[PDB]
Ligand binder design. Sequence first.
Ligand SMILES: *[C@@H]1O[C@H](CO)[C@@H](O[C@@H]2O[C@H](CO)[C@@H](O)[C@H](O)[C@H]2NC(C)=O)[C@H](O[C@@H]2O[C@@H](C)[C@@H](O)[C@@H](O)[C@@H]2O)[C@H]1NC(C)=O
Ligand SMILES: *[C@@H]1O[C@H](CO)[C@@H](O[C@@H]2O[C@H](CO)[C@@H](O)[C@H](O)[C@H]2NC(C)=O)[C@H](O[C@@H]2O[C@@H](C)[C@@H](O)[C@@H](O)[C@@H]2O)[C@H]1NC(C)=O
Ligand code: NAG
Ligand code: NAG
Ligand code: NAG
Ligand code: NAG
Ligand code: VN3
Ligand code: FE
Ligand code: FE
Ligand code: NA
Ligand code: NA
Ligand code: ZN
Ligand code: ZN
Lengths: 423, 426
Amino acid sequence: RDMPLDSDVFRVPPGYNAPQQVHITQGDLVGRAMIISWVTMDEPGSSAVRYWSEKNGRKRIAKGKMSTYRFFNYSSGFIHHTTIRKLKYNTKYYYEVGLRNTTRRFSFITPPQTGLDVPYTFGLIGDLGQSFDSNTTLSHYELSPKKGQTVLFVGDLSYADRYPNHDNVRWDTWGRFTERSVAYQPWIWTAGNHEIEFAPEINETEPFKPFSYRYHVPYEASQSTSPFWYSIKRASAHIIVLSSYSAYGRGTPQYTWLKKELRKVKRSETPWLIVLMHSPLYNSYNHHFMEGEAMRTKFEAWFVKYKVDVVFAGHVHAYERSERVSNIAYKITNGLCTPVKDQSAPVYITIGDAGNYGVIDSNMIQPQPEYSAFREASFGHGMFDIKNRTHAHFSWNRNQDGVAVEADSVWFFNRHWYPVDDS
Amino acid sequence: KNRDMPLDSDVFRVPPGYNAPQQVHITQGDLVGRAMIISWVTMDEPGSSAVRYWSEKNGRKRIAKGKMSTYRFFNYSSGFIHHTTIRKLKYNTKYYYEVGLRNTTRRFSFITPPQTGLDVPYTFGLIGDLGQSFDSNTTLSHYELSPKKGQTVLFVGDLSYADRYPNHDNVRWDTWGRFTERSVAYQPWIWTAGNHEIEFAPEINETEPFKPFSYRYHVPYEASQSTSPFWYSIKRASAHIIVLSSYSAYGRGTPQYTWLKKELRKVKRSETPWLIVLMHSPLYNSYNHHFMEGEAMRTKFEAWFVKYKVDVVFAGHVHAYERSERVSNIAYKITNGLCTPVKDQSAPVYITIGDAGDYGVIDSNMIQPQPEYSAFREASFGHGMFDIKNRTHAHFSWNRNQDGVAVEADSVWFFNRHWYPVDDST
Ligand SMILES: *[C@@H]1O[C@H](CO)[C@@H](O[C@@H]2O[C@H](CO)[C@@H](O)[C@H](O)[C@H]2NC(C)=O)[C@H](O[C@@H]2O[C@@H](C)[C@@H](O)[C@@H](O)[C@@H]2O)[C@H]1NC(C)=O
Ligand SMILES: *[C@@H]1O[C@H](CO)[C@@H](O[C@@H]2O[C@H](CO)[C@@H](O)[C@H](O)[C@H]2NC(C)=O)[C@H](O[C@@H]2O[C@@H](C)[C@@H](O)[C@@H](O)[C@@H]2O)[C@H]1NC(C)=O
Ligand SMILES: *[C@@H]1O[C@H](CO)[C@@H](O)[C@H](O)[C@H]1NC(C)=O
Ligand SMILES: *[C@@H]1O[C@H](CO)[C@@H](O)[C@H](O)[C@H]1NC(C)=O
Ligand SMILES: *[C@@H]1O[C@H](CO)[C@@H](O)[C@H](O)[C@H]1NC(C)=O
Ligand SMILES: *[C@@H]1O[C@H](CO)[C@@H](O)[C@H](O)[C@H]1NC(C)=O
Ligand code: VN3
Ligand SMILES: [Fe+3]
Ligand SMILES: [Fe+3]
Ligand code: NA
Ligand code: NA
Ligand SMILES: [Zn+2]
Ligand SMILES: [Zn+2]
């Protein structure tokens, strides 16, 4: 069910050395920067980005870096990453790439300065892939009247690793296909298991290699030492991105980083505390049942201690919304291993249903457990729409519904600023 | 509070002569025991990485050529580290070897193991969390003086504790190398990485995990088709030893997870009936210190250990001694309430042996009451011995530093899970 190579969504932008696979993401901690990324296929080209605000109309130049990689017998084109800095808040910018030969122009709008009541609408997309289902989900997202301003992407991007030798051409197609969204609004990247691409049989033993060359993240801005875990702040939200497939034992870099990062969160500046990871800690579907248990034993108690509002994950190709529950009272021999209602705990949402390679996960463990509020095996996407420091509205849209139809929706009451039972 | 041996202690003396090799240490260099990695440091100049070696019988002297490396850690600059692999050795024979051939030569010896086989006896020492306190020295002394005669040390992690010093003062890696040489220059120590080897110190711009340890202690990880030094397998006599990394990734689909799943399928109990796992952090631990830190890895690998009938899992990290019953806790399914360990005669025994001395502190606070899964636990310094007699029987003993070197405060017969799975409860 993967879209054929000649699909319209995979068309090559015309013109000699025209930039393609253009994508942007936040480039700093607070929203004044953007990483601009693209690929040129005919020759290295310039890594310069020309950009200007609509407000001041002053054309500026930022210089970046070009890189290449190989994977088995695949050789990449020329990958460009350029960080535009010192941007004004809440301002429309135009930017151009391909300054030496064929120039292409895009735009984005910077977020407002971080603050207590700053509204912002986040899209939720996971396990996207490049099937016709993937295209429908992307269409529904961009047609949504809630108007997403940034996608929180919970992992499993291209599924290129399903192809012979992970045929990395399917990374190039995915980049051309997603450009119509991510060239104009940031996607916040989480690494999933299809990004691991550990393939010792063809001597590719470096985890996350193609993904890490193609998708950069501002990980140094939160004093992380690795691209696979990091934080950003945007509007009223503090977003923590974790790596299900990296080390998280006590004392490891990721564990150390997260422990310190949670102490740095200021709910008086960013009231909405959001965690992204690929593998869900709470999941009542058959597929990947209990894979999240290892990270849960390490980090669940911290999520409760710090009153995380919501944890988004993918991996399971379906939709699930938990109750606020915790399973943190276990001590090996005390028998306390059943999740209980816990209003201090986040809501766990699985949103890995954007299409993958066309397969939905319909097998559910029955009956629906007490910890699960709502689950359905349909393709779709989410929207987390912050109104102010106390209220955020989450909605789930199905591909088989109208683009303005929400099959599930719930009001989030903030755990720090308004801890009322939002059951 | 500071019980570390002072820099001028006799165990830290520098071998005399210009560029004399120091911190000499060996470990198995291949999968089956026909090779040895020879390692050492020269301090005055790079020197030669050549190793001269010969058996005590035929006496034909050969040269193996190795590689030199250096590293920096903050304001520390290492000396010149040599690693050289001697290959194609004969089984069960004594070899002499010489390092420092350019200037000051020093000579040592080792005895290769017998060829792997079903009924091959072999005596393994167990040492965890050694450190360089006076307690550490006593433990090493007790091991060297054992009447049972250890032939290889299985070391379950936390080596030098240099990371406790300001800027992890890597001089304390050098001292530890000189201190331990009296043992490890003559018999292999099998290295497991512990949390004191991570040395993740972003505050001083040292962010490469395991850097000083991995420069100083090499392992034959390619021999078992691992892509990382931090997890690997070796076979020695009748034992198949799997070394895991508590502080590397082990999620589904990760390199270590993938490697272990495939490696367990390669185990042949008719060739190496004793299946032994090493890791730093214990999956079963009834002490307060580090209680339940092993849960995450336990969720991933415990069921595999039972499926493959691992005989024993050795760990350190807790600075005390513990021996579990044969139990498993693998039946949990979130909502089925099955989260209590049960007797399980396919399961390994879990032994915590992280009590060789560290920086001088014992972990004495225990979970009360002693849980059913715990057979024996005691907060004393000491070390262990896993003495394989044959394919059905291995004798494990625990010697305390406060006792005579021949006294075993705890001991138990292991009955092999493949050839003789009798209840061997204490
Ligand atoms: C924070 O955002 C909430 C969601 O928009 C606000 O609630 C909404 O307030 C409207 C009046 O401004 C009201 O018609 C809507 O029904 C309501 N939506 C709900 C409750 O889901 C909230 O407004 C405060 O709380 C509500 C319950 C009323 O008491 C309002 O008068 C309050 O202003 C916003 N909080 C603010 C603005 O402080
Ligand atoms: C493997 O080694 C075991 C320990 O040395 C052997 O058991 C010991 O056998 C002695 C002489 O047969 C006997 O005096 C000891 O009591 C006994 N030790 C223990 C702890 O049981 C074992 O020998 C077999 O097993 C024992 C239990 C008897 O049935 C013997 O008759 C058997 O030969 C060795 N097993 C082998 C070589 O297969
Ligand atoms: C993908 O969806 C877009 C927007 O609905 C449509 O124009 C395009 O033809 C689709 N391409 C496919 C399904 O290959
Ligand atoms: C890579 O190798 C496969 C065979 O394993 C072949 O079919 C494919 O065309 C090769 N691709 C390139 C770009 O050489
Ligand atoms: C490294 O810095 C420490 C702390 O300032 C100092 O005591 C030590 O002598 C230094 N080591 C060097 C410069 O080799
Ligand atoms: C360490 O132990 C050895 C052997 O028991 C002894 O000769 C030496 O003096 C000790 N060194 C210390 C305690 O510093
Ligand atoms: O083999 V002779 O140099 O002691
Ligand atoms: Fe997926
Ligand atoms: Fe220790
Ligand atoms: Na699974
Ligand atoms: Na996992
Ligand atoms: Zn996945
Ligand atoms: Zn430890």
